[PDB]
Amino acid sequence: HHMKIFLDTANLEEIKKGVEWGIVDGVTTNPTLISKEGAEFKQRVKEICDLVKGPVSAEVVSLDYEGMVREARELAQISEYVVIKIPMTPDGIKAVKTLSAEGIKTNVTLVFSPAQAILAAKAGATYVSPFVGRMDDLSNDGMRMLGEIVEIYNNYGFETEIIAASIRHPMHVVEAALMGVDIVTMPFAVLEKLFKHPMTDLGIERFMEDWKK
Amino acid sequence: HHMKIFLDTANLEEIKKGVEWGIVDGVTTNPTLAEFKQRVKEICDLVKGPVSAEVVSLDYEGMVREARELAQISEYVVIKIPMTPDGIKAVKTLSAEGIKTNVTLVFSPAQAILAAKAGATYVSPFVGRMDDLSNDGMRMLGEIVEIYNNYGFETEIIAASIRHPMHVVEAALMGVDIVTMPFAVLEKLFKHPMTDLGIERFMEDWKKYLENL
Amino acid sequence: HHMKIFLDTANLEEIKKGVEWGIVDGVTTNPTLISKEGAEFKQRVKEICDLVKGPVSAEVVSLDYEGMVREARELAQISEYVVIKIPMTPDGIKAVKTLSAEGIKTNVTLVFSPAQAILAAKAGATYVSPFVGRMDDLSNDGMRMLGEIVEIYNNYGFETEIIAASIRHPMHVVEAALMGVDIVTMPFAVLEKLFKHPMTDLGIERFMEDWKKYLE
Amino acid sequence: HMKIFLDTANLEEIKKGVEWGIVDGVTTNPTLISKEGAEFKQRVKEICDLVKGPVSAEVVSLDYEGMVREARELAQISEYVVIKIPMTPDGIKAVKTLSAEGIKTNVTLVFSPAQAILAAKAGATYVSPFVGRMDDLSNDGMRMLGEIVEIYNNYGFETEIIAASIRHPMHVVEAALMGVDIVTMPFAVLEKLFKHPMTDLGIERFMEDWKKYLEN
Amino acid sequence: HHMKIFLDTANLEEIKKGVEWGIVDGVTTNPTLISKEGAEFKQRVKEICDLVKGPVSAEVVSLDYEGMVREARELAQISEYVVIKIPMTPDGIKAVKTLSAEGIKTNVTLVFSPAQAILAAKAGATYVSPFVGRMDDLSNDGMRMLGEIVEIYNNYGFETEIIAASIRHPMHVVEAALMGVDIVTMPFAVLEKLFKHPMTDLGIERFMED
Amino acid sequence: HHMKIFLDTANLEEIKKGVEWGIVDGVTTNPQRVKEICDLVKGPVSAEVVSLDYEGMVREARELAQISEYVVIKIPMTPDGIKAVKTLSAEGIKTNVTLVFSPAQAILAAKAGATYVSPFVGRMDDLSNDGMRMLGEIVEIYNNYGFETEIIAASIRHPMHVVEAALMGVDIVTMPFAVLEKLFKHPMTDLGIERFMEDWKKYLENL
Amino acid sequence: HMKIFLDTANLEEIKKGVEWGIVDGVTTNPTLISKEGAEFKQRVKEICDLVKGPVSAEVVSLDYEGMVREARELAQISEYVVIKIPMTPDGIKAVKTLSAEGIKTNVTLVFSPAQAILAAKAGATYVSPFVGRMDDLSNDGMRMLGEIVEIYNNYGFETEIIAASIRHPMHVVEAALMGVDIVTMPFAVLEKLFKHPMTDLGIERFME
Amino acid sequence: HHMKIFLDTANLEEIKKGVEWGIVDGVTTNPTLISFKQRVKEICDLVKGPVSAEVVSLDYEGMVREARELAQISEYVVIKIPMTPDGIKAVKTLSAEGIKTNVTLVFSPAQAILAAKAGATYVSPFVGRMDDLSNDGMRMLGEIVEIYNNYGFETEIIAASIRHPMHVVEAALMGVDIVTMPFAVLEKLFKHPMTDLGIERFMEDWKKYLE
Amino acid sequence: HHMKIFLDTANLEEIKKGVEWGIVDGVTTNPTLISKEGAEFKQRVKEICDLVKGPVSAEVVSLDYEGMVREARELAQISEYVVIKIPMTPDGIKAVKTLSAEGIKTNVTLVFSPAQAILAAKAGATYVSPFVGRMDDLSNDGMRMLGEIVEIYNNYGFETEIIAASIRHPMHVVEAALMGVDIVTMPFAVLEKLFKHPMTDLGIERFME
């Protein structure tokens, strides 16, 4: 029932730091994010799985149903932790139906509406990833759409878990936690911020000043 | 349990598409949607879930007579009964014989309570038609959801006369059991311009990651 | 639950329709109603019990404690379904304490406040009957008083069941259902109204032309 | 000030209404007049002379030409005559025409806020949403009325809202609480508004206190 | 427009105390209260008027329209401050319409519903007196009925002023004030209570202690 | 303060129909005839420009404005469009900023001096991102600051859009004729008319 | 619009307050006046001269006649002097009298909205509800203040509300959020209002 | 699931009075109030409930080393860990070894989530210190309580930096697990002037009864 | 009564584009920003003033009262549009009192609490600048803190205007607008985002025949 924190990264030092802290439960990874890093796609996913020992989402290349399913099966054989990122499309939903029936975990991504979220859950997705920050930047309120998806999923007890994605800043995390999102996936830089508070630092000096005297 | 989506259709490709997606749970039908009993059998074998089919007669005896005949087509067949005194009398009789019913042409919460008390398997409030009167069909649906939550009537609510995506989202936010919709509306539920942009971007990026070698 | 619907009637044809629809659970009665049907009191209470096979509330003549109890015992003998209507008075509450201990069901009637309703439950009444329409006519809001009684009975889980009474029109029934009242008792004329909607009629005209088109 | 009109053609009840200083106008129809043994116009004149406030009267025709024709002839009876026009396309056309000629209109048979907006935009003097008839469909007529009041407040349409199809005291109180301009009701409803059992008891008690004051 | 406080009394010492404090704006009266002072009705009403120099509500004997009007005119002659108490009935409302037209001030009393309060206002009452505490005792909530009347009167700006009547205790006063009733009429005993708080007394001992 | 109804049309019979009823205040158009419409409605008639560059938009706007005092120039919500609104406002040329899907866009439209903004409700609804909520945010912000810009609820698809827009107090709703026709209608009205005729019949039998 | 008074008799803290342009008056007690090293009347005068705004000062007597007598005496010190009157029947009588003479009053020791109504009807210039002292009883002083604000708004009493018995910044903020006319607070609380750790970090950063 | 009250104290007389009343369930300490090992032991023996005690070191290795030393004093000892990256690392380690932890210096709900995820026994948000910044400490506490209800973190919330009675009441009204307070504030909670007057009066009635 | 938009910048091209659009009303600056353009402090402030012809907030070097006032008077001479940024400190507040009395406009900056904002208004600040984004990052909700300030300033009609500052993204702007803040100051990058919507683009292509 604990809130899960995933990292949006392929950087292994930051994932080690996350697990050191006992705060990071998985990783979401990407074309873009592996574009940032430039190592072996399958290799990098295996390394990450070994490190976090929790859900690692990895995207498929193909966009047609047959190719998505083919590649999903391939990626799934890397590790029991691998979760397949599927884009929210009709073929992607078809793929989730097929892959869920063979025990392959899926993460439906690029979700921007509660309607899409419903479909993802009904198709049997393991996770859904609504993109909060990208909606917020349209000024159409991504936290509100996240709240509608939570509400709907609470109404029906869909087994699908919600990953609040496109998380940009600490308030995203706090508001997600206040509405009771299952998982928040965030950049390491955002995670680092969550530790910090200027009153904490003053409190600590109100210790350290003393022992000089 | 899960929110159910039925299709308002008799088109078998649409239904096939629906089941391929793993998102369509049943079908609601009418004559206008080519031989009646056959089309119903074909649809039953395809969806393998509740298929609502309407009777010709409006007198109690005729409704019951015809319901029994339609019920023989398939275990999946649900008999559509119009909200009338005789229709309610026919629901009492049919429920006692294990024949599934869907009370239709419901435009008030009062009608909905009689339907449930008579033993209807489903009730179908007509949202869109009320909306067009400017008397708010979604509010009337919400009243029916509220009443049925109050008493735990076994009857399930099918939000009907669904015209657009916001009907489906609002119905889901109030926790309606089932929403029955045209296939065209279903198709819209998959779609978002931010999804399409995200797909273009993930490709552009991946293809630049691959272009690196 | 299931929300229950009782009929305020002594007419057997109306009750027969009510049970033919599978929608009427019981009947609330009074001497006037029965009297109006050319029926004797006990036969007609009996006739009604046999027909509805569900709670049939019937009033006693006496207002003193001893007489109420005596007559309640006599009426209870008519049928297992008979529920004794007791007016909300000190003596009537006393009578409910006594009758409840003997397994005789009671319906405390003439309730116009939540305070009265608490006493009826605490005495062990099977039912309480707040008079909504009558309070409405005083412009003191009967639905609001009904909502307060439902809220109190939800807080404490009194076994006593609430019969929305003095129901005049369909919104009374809908508002009562929306608050979750246990039972609404209504005239048959009100029940008939509940079936009806203009859009249902137009839908039926339409699905008939759709069918006549299709045969083609 | 909230206005009260009477749904009646009875002159005694209108005289009482004016004696009490609480009736501002009257809404009529041919059946009320017929019930009184009266020819239509005449009974409208009689009522105008008595209430000396807005008296709503219907026309026979439903086509735009005939409505306008007849409206003009009715309007000549008295400065107080307000022409009832059914909410239709032709009726709305007639309102535009008649408002431009200084003839007052009451758009009747309104059952939705969309209808109400059209009536106001056409320039209706009054709009009459039918609360009780909606209530009986269990679609909540008071909520519909509230939506119209809300919209009318948003835009300050000159059109005044007459809460119509009023059946009981709570209708009036609820319409007052939302601030409708006018409530038109049957006399029987008006009579109920005066009444309360605690007022009666207060008067019994007040007579006892004078009686005792005097004795000492 | 300040909230007004009227006293339910005929006792002149209580009223003098009330005016000494600059808190009492008027008086509502009845034969019982007067009787209990050992006083005649019309005389006592005059003495109260002279003392409070504000609205003094006084009841008429008759219940028929003609007798109520006759008597109201006689009582009105006592003083410019006299307000005629009229029970809420059809004939009472008829009388208000008549008396309003003659410049005679009226206070419609025995009001137990918002419907009654509407008619009182429409007939032209100077004041309406909803009976809060007696409704409260029926457990049908007199404060809620008062708030309904306040709401309705705000919606239409009736000139009629609301006197929260049948006031029993300080919370009646405070709740009536929070909803913004025009006037509260209360027993002196209730007014005395309003001054009081144990922390005030403790504060006074402490800025005596030092 | 009256709510305005514009028609989404170029059909002159439906516009005559609308003005006959005294319920249509203007017209919004899309893909010469603009003059005919102006003459008929004698109220704001929004017409789009071809160009998308600032220079071209302004050039064309000036040309269209000369057809009639009633002409309002449709400008798409873009940087160049906003620049064009600045310029045209200064010259007394009325503008209607269209393709608005966020409150952020509407603020800029108002600040640049748009006569009207047109939020697209129905199109947002179909994204299941709630177009009526977006409109309500724009109404709220415009009430906070009293922008002189008036809000045209656009992309209106059905009666409830109109009723909800009214309940929020939008300045103007622009709708298809088909929607406007629906607004007149109710089954209880029809029944009451049938009943009304029955009572005149009765009334006649009885003397 | 919001006024800030200081609960003090210390002239350096009052000077700081006026230097900052944020202190509008002073509320006093002989405890503070003697705590400095001065006499009732003198320091009241010195404070008036310094703050040039309302300076509330308490009387010794509790009987009506003595309260009025002393109030007149104190009022002669400066046009700024406002007389503190305890919320009692005699105190309310005194307010009626002194209002009529143009002498300003501050009804103090108010713990209920009923008391506040009487204070306003008697013609008090100010009322001072004791927030923190109620808070300590766990009966919620800020709620009782909120009720008085709400009632004064309802009726537009000319009497102004001084939130008193203020002990910490959140009292000030909550008072401001409800729109109290005036908050009177100790100097120590005022000093806190300036402060935030993010401000200090901002200063290290920007000025760097 | 009673609300717990802890005492911010090292004074044993106050603690004794607290356990005599049957109201005090534990104690939160610091070296200040201590005028280290033996007193913590004396307090543990007296309260027989959770006794929070802080470590000297701020690096992860030193924190963990000292926590294990303190933990051997008594089963009741809970180790105070400041909300830092190393502190949270320490919590993970110590939780795994069955050593109880109290994450302190919490000023945001973000911090509070990390503490619960790390497996802290308790978290101590500093209400009063935030209140004094005028950023509303009770609101931040409410946010943490709502979050911990959403997810059912086993971590319990200790409302800390409690300065007055309304802090206690508002923390109770939001359903915080535990409130740690100074004795002085505890003393205040007993008191009300209407109680005192009721007792004066009840006496008066006895002496009248004895008529 | 219009909502004002200021730019957080010293870049003149961005300010020109802002004024071209007729949506930028002023500028808030710092020497970080101006150095990144490679420019002298006062000359850049003057250039900006000429360009926006609206309020241009500029920070002083000193933190003691005397120096702040001294420098403020010097900056104020540059242009009628110059507004002096003063950090929320006791001396800063002292300086606001003094400078207000001389008709020199002030912007109290580094505000993180409503208490701070009341003192700023009472001392006579022209503007107050609450730092939303930095509070947000502490997870203490900067929008809520801004809302409290707006509410307080509405309660009392302080003449001081609120500049929502530390604005990082489009929802900051929309939520500040929904609360009715007087002014939002934002980076150009955020202003650019405000124009944009994918449905606007698609609508354009649908007429791009």
From Swiss-Prot, chain C:
UniProt-listed PROSITE patterns: TRANSALDOLASE_1, TRANSALDOLASE_2
Main localisation: cytoplasm
EC numbers on record: 2.2.1.2
Reactions listed under catalytic activity: D-sedoheptulose 7-phosphate + D-glyceraldehyde 3-phosphate = D-erythrose 4-phosphate + beta-D-fructose 6-phosphate
Pathway participation: Carbohydrate degradation; pentose phosphate pathway; D-glyceraldehyde 3-phosphate and beta-D-fructose 6-phosphate from D-ribose 5-phosphate and D-xylulose 5-phosphate (non-oxidative stage): step 2/3
Active site as annotated: 85
Pfam (any one): TAL_FSA
One GO MF term attached to the UniProt entry: transaldolase activity
GO CC terms: cytoplasm
Subcellular location, record wording: Cytoplasm
Taxonomy, superkingdom: Bacteria
Any one GO BP annotation for this protein: pentose-phosphate shunt
Keywords of this entry: Cytoplasm, Pentose shunt, Schiff base, Transferase
Listed Gene3D superfamilies: Aldolase class I
PANTHER family hit by this protein: FRUCTOSE-6-PHOSPHATE ALDOLASE 1-RELATED (PTHR10683:SF40), TRANSALDOLASE (PTHR10683)
Function according to Swiss-Prot or TrEMBL: Transaldolase is important for the balance of metabolites in the pentose-phosphate pathway. Does not show fructose-6-P aldolase activity.
Family: Belongs to the transaldolase family. Type 3B subfamily.
Record-given protein name: Transaldolase
Species of provenance: Thermotoga maritima (strain ATCC 43589 / DSM 3109 / JCM 10099 / NBRC 100826 / MSB8)
Organism classification: Bacteria, Thermotogati, Thermotogota, Thermotogae, Thermotogales
Curated annotation (Swiss-Prot), chain F:
Record's catalysed reaction(s): D-sedoheptulose 7-phosphate + D-glyceraldehyde 3-phosphate = D-erythrose 4-phosphate + beta-D-fructose 6-phosphate
Top enzyme class: transferase
CDD domains xrefs: Transaldolase_FSA (cd00956)
Residue numbers annotated as active site: 74 (schiff-base intermediate with substrate)
Location, primary (coarse class): cytoplasm
Pathway recorded for this protein: Carbohydrate degradation; pentose phosphate pathway; D-glyceraldehyde 3-phosphate and beta-D-fructose 6-phosphate from D-ribose 5-phosphate and D-xylulose 5-phosphate (non-oxidative stage): step 2/3
GO (cellular component) term, any one: cytoplasm
Signal peptide: none
GO molecular function terms attached to this record: aldehyde-lyase activity; transaldolase activity
Any single biological process term in GO: carbohydrate metabolic process
Record's keyword terms, sorted: Cytoplasm, Pentose shunt, Schiff base, Transferase
Keyword Transferase annotated: yes
UniProt xrefs under InterPro entries: Aldolase_TIM, TAL/FSA, Transaldolase_3B, Transaldolase_3B/F6P_aldolase, Transaldolase_AS, TSA/FSA_arc/bac
EC number: 2.2.1.2
Cell location: Cytoplasm
Family: Belongs to the transaldolase family. Type 3B subfamily.
Function: Transaldolase is important for the balance of metabolites in the pentose-phosphate pathway. Does not show fructose-6-P aldolase activity.
HAMAP family, sorted: Transaldolase_3b
Protein name (Swiss-Prot/TrEMBL): Transaldolase
Organism from which the protein derives: Thermotoga maritima (strain ATCC 43589 / DSM 3109 / JCM 10099 / NBRC 100826 / MSB8)
Lineage: Bacteria, Thermotogati, Thermotogota, Thermotogae, Thermotogales
Name of the gene encoding the protein in the UniProt record: tal
From Swiss-Prot, chain G:
Keywords of this entry: Cytoplasm, Pentose shunt, Schiff base, Transferase
GO cellular component entries: cytoplasm
Function, as annotated: Transaldolase is important for the balance of metabolites in the pentose-phosphate pathway. Does not show fructose-6-P aldolase activity.
InterPro entries the record matches: Aldolase_TIM, TAL/FSA, Transaldolase_3B, Transaldolase_3B/F6P_aldolase, Transaldolase_AS, TSA/FSA_arc/bac
Catalytic activity: D-sedoheptulose 7-phosphate + D-glyceraldehyde 3-phosphate = D-erythrose 4-phosphate + beta-D-fructose 6-phosphate
EC number(s) on file: 2.2.1.2
Organism: Thermotoga maritima (strain ATCC 43589 / DSM 3109 / JCM 10099 / NBRC 100826 / MSB8)
Family statement drawn from the similarity comment of this UniProt entry: Belongs to the transaldolase family. Type 3B subfamily.
Protein's name in the database: Transaldolase
CDD domains reported for this sequence: Transaldolase_FSA
Gene Ontology BP terms: carbohydrate metabolic process; pentose-phosphate shunt
Catalytic machinery residues: 84
Subcellular location: Cytoplasm
Main location (coarse class): cytoplasm
Coiled-coil zones: none
Pathway the protein acts in: Carbohydrate degradation; pentose phosphate pathway; D-glyceraldehyde 3-phosphate and beta-D-fructose 6-phosphate from D-ribose 5-phosphate and D-xylulose 5-phosphate (non-oxidative stage): step 2/3
The gene coding this protein: tal
Cited PROSITE patterns: TRANSALDOLASE_1, TRANSALDOLASE_2
A single GO molecular function term of this UniProt record: transaldolase activity
EC category: transferase
